[PDB]
Symmetry: C4
Subunit: 356 residues, 4 copies
């Protein structure tokens, strides 16, 4: 018999149970930790993708208390210059700044790009995000040890992983956070192309339990479709959430608006798609090239997302995230329960800002 | 590791098993309790929503044996006027009308937290029951509100909600409510589970809350999620004493709101009270929509109660209390659900109780 | 503290496992029992519906070795006439005949319709089919007892039921077969309108285990979508299968062909639909002349595609069953039930079992 | 009560768990065994179907390191010539095909399908130099198939023989004891197959592979996972469970090299694809397959390239240097319906064409 280790759940499989509450949504606190040494004022990170995060999107994310990660599908000098435009940047009272009062910013790197790390460190990057399709690999782990050995005070994120053993390996190599998510991304085809993946709720749960033994936060990356998934990811034990598709159709993301059959869209594509890899430099992709509807400014998207998190926390009775994770209790639901949860049997006539 | 309390089920996960029957559907009795003191002659309540229940719909529901709950999306003066319009209304055409001791139609009215002024006026207007509703019933504000109301009006029947856990039912019952309303997330226009990730599938929520409310002798109202008459039967069979309905009544003559035509068909607006339009940035927990026009509340109510009577016939139950003692369920699969519905045949004529 | 007895399954939830086979599909025997005293030469019965079985359909079903049940949505004299047309009727070497060489036929009756039974017996009906929405009821049981006391030699089928205790009550009442099916019919809305029903595979299995203790056959009625569901139902322990929608679109069924958007259809409706009940409300109104209570139906009115002769449909259906018994290695229906082993499958396994990822260009005679 | 042996899973019910990896996808080795005595340099076989494999397709499959099985819906002389066209084909290309799958004389390897009782066909295929004969039935666990296996091995002890199709451990034990050199697994999974709908008989493919591998390993007999492969990730799943190779129909039917012509429908190009148990292939009959069409997808080489690239990527995720190491390391999770929708593309309209996903 084959080895089936567990039955794994994703976001749509579970719901949070309400608990006795003495707090209102507008009163809760949504600050969290990005790494062992960097805090966020709100728990959202924009994804490190060339249709999501350059300097315009990163500045707004940090102004709102979160973070943006500049994607690595550009030359070193262009990434340095994008980082510096963020660092050089009453209406944004929750801005996430460093000790010098400059906005905080992240930047993506790959294996074997130490010149890129050197230049981004010199540019004053706050955190380096070492990402890969398979974070639980010798190359990633050796690259972690190398960066940490040369820049001990540089906060370093590594991913992506989906198992507890992977979280142990990365924590023991010296990361300041692990990023969890193999397969959940809206534009990801890894589970279809290679057959590999772990549903995100189970992957978060498995990795948070291990990483907590090292005091290392977990970033939940991929598969967020609604503000409710942010709440579920945080309640299971993640410290922050990375989001791609829900921010790709905003004013601040790179790329221009275009019109298709009467509506406005922006491009949104995986970094492992043919289009992203060919602009960078027969390939076997693990992402698709797509479009998402234009949804206005990042500020209004972020406002609805955190408004859903605040409501969730209010339902559970939690004053802050750590209390949210302590109090959280779940129910596993069925396909019919999912249909009951969504809008059903009623035609929608007006566009809802947090539900599409 | 994360704490998963249970695997929770909703209406379409289960069906009632038939049992030996000596009763006929047209002879069973469908009276029930709304609160500890107020009875209903039939177990349906129209939702406290501004596209469902004002005075016109509240009168029909009461005339047919149930109850209408005036919504709170109006100033205090208008709600008092709506309630008094029901109490003044009224007979061989409505022999099951739900009346009070003075021969007046019974009617309820919705209130929010910290609206004592509203409670005072609806009491002096002769309201039969006050319905304290909130998105989160298991909260300090609701509990204190319950304590404050029952202290000032010990004889005013008070419904509070909405809840989805036994621990929430215990809290409200000890606070002194006369009925609890169960439903976090199941409503047709509700996005709470999607926006916040919080909710409990309705069958499990009812089951859990009734077990705890029964210890205090407190009836449970199953609010939201009803799509077919069979859902009414399952909710009552699980232990609910009554069912509150919105979408199935929004498209009727007696609901507030204009009839309008759209692409050849007539509709009425139907929207959640937590939607942007109802609350007028805001973070809504409902959506604004439309439902097809269906005719009078009377013809809808007739079909829904006919399904309930049919189900009680299949189970062999003479009344709802006997219904709850005899009821046995099976859990079914997705394939079982598809087999339960109409399948492999194109429907060509309208059926009054199936769409 | 709600009471969930079990997790119940239907046809699409299970598949038969193949077994070692020394038999060929064309060689297996598919004779079976309709009641304790009447045999069939193949296990198919056409449904007692006014869009499925009148004398034409019933003649063809008996000629092919099965049985047709004349529906009861007509006055007694009309049902008697339909029965006699069938009794009156070597291209059909498997024809299902009585001791006198006449085609066998069934006829439906309702609670308390003794006058209908007396006329059907006189017409030579071979089996009376006592039908109610709820067979596990005092009205049904009392009717079974009165018919059996008056006509001890008349074979009686009663239904429909879905539980062991229901099968026990009808068997002790004296039926010659029970008919199983609360909710599975293609045109049935009982489970949605009332919330009552049992998934059909579990209903058969539970009822067969109990009815077998009395030696009483089980008729699996409703929910058959493909020839593979006939195989599953018999493998679980049913002795025969009653079929509505797969036979409604045939030449022999009552009703005319009509065209809708370039293709032909026939009407198909539940006997508990508004349309089927309209005629009885019309008789009831003119008799008394009183404003009547509006009906609350448990079925819908629809249409099915035209599929040609009942002969070609039955041939394909029986071909699937013979193929299944070849896969299982079974020489006959009894051997089929002895050898049958199932797997429970997932929703993804159901998609894999159907045609997937390929657009169908020519429609198969046994698959849509 | 009815006997329910197990709850069976298929490809979409499971996912491979990532493991610690020191291997790059480029460096893994994907050779495997077709039978006890014939090796493949990549683990894919083209289906024995009159819309998939004749000589052109079998030539490309062998050039790329796999195998093609000439279908049996033709007279004996026609099948002999199809085999001869492959055996006499140039194996090398314009170092273009460095992984070509050859016999002892440097000729491309090829298979040919046969039915029960067609000994004259077997004799002619042997004389033509066929490398493997594929005795396929709808029901391999039958007395007719067992007897044909015994007759063929008695007359040609050194002819490699595959037999199928089966889906139970008992069926695998039967064929192995009869003397097959590989068993073919698959009752019902095929894209054009209706067996499970027409007869109610079948086993979901992942459980069927798992069950037959565990038995067939006791006899040293490889398992061929036949049918239901929709994506490259399904190939990885079948091998990880223990199958030694994978037989594919629908994904190769729309290629240049498959038999049958291109046609256009509504502005797009298609090739016909049909089950061999469909009415058209068999010419009242009772079919167990349908006739259909699949999109035109270009050359077999471009399809095979993306399929193997997905398996290589899968083995890199698991950390496996070759197939046997793949099967030792592989751990699975079982997922829900909601986990499958999260696995596919969701909430985003696909604009461009993906060579390995649609
Ligand atoms: C995130 C993501 N999701 O698919 C993705 C992003 C960009 C590119 C790719 C491509 C399409 C190029 N796909 C792989 O890179 N696939 C893959 C599969 C299996 C392994 Cl084991 C590895 C490894 N990469 C390394 C690294 F070079 F990073 F060190 C060591 S091992 C890589 C994928
Ligand atoms: C029924 C319902 N379903 O969504 C709904 C109806 C109207 C308005 C809302 C809006 C959109 C305004 N959403 C919330 O009100 N969301 C929410 C979320 C979490 C908590 Cl903890 C609370 C609370 N409100 C109170 C108060 F006392 F004020 F009533 C105490 S606790 C409230 C929701
Ligand atoms: C591959 C395949 N998949 O369906 C298929 C291919 C061609 C034809 C058929 C048809 C449509 C003809 N279907 C059966 O042949 N179905 C079936 C079902 C059960 C058994 Cl036991 C047998 C057997 N036939 C033999 C014989 F020797 F006659 F060949 C020995 S056992 C056969 C199926
Ligand atoms: C098959 C079927 N539906 O599946 C059906 C066929 C015709 C009519 C009906 C209608 C729409 C009229 N539906 C019921 O008759 N539903 C129902 C539900 C529960 C019980 Cl307990 C009873 C009973 N009626 C009797 C009587 F004596 F009156 F005939 C004895 S028991 C009846 C249904
Ligand atoms: O091409 C890819 N293949 C697989 N995953 C990707 C690819 N590109 C980006 N991702 C991941 O998907 C995340 C965004 O997912 P989303 O928020 O659901 O759209 C990113 O932050 C990456 O972790
Ligand atoms: O906007 C809202 N958000 C969530 N729930 C609502 C909202 N408005 C009304 N509800 C609930 O949904 C019920 C109606 O559900 P329905 O019967 O399925 O349409 C009401 O009685 C309320 O309990
Ligand atoms: O209107 C009805 N409501 C519920 N069940 C019905 C009705 N009319 C017929 N049936 C049942 O459904 C069977 C036909 O189901 P089918 O073969 O799936 O279409 C009949 O033989 C009856 O047992
Ligand atoms: O008509 C048939 N009925 C059932 N299975 C078939 C039929 N024809 C071919 N097959 C099987 O289906 C496989 C191809 O499945 P596919 O790769 O999913 O299209 C073949 O290799 C055969 O094993
Ligand atoms: K909802
Ligand atoms: K049905
Ligand atoms: K199939
Ligand atoms: K995905």
């Amino acid at each position: 018999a084959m080895k089936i280790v567990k039955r794994a759940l994703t976001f749509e499989d579970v719901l949070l149970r309400p608990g006795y509450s003495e707090v209102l949504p507008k009163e809760v606190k949504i600050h969290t930790k990005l790494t062992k040494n960097i805090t966020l004022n709100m728990p959202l990170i924009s994804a490190a993708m060339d249709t999501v995060t350059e300097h315009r999107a990163a500045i707004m994310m940090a102004r709102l208390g979160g973070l943006g990660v500049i994607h690595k599908n550009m030359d070193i000098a262009s990434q340095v210059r994008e980082v510096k435009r963020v660092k050089k940047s009453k209406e944004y009272p929750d801005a996430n700044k460093d000790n010098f009062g400059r906005l905080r910013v992240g930047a993506a790197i790959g294996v074997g790009q130490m010149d890129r790390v050197d230049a981004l460190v010199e540019a004053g990057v706050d955190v380096v995000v070492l990402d890969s399709a398979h974070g639980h690999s010798k190359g990633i782990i050796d690259t972690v040890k190398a960066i940490k050995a040369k820049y001990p005070n540089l906060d370093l994120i590594a991913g992506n992983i989906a198992t507890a053993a992977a979280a142990k390996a990365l924590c023991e190599a010296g990361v300041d956070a692990v990023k969890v998510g193999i397969g959940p991304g809206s534009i990801c085809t890894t589970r279809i192309v290679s057959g590999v993946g772990v549903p995100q709720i189970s992957a978060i749960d498995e990795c948070v339990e291990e990483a907590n033994k090292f005091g290392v936060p977990v970033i939940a990356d991929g598969g967020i479709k609604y503000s409710g998934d942010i709440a579920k990811a945080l309640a299971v034990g993640a410290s922050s959430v990375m989001i791609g598709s829900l921010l790709a159709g905003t004013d601040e993301s790179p790329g221009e608006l275009f019109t298709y059959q009467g509506r406005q869209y922006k491009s949104y594509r995986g970094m492992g798609s043919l289009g992203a890899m060919q602009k960078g430099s027969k390939l076997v992709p693990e992402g698709i090239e797509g479009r998402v509807p234009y949804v206005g400014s990042i500020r209004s998207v972020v406002h609805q997302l955190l408004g859903g998190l605040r409501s969730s926390m209010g339902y559970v009775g939690a004053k802050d995230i750590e209390d949210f994770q302590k109090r959280a209790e779940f129910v596993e639901i069925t396909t019919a329960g999912l249909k009951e949860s969504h809008v059903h049997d009623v035609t929608i006539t007006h566009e809802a800002p947090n539900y599409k």
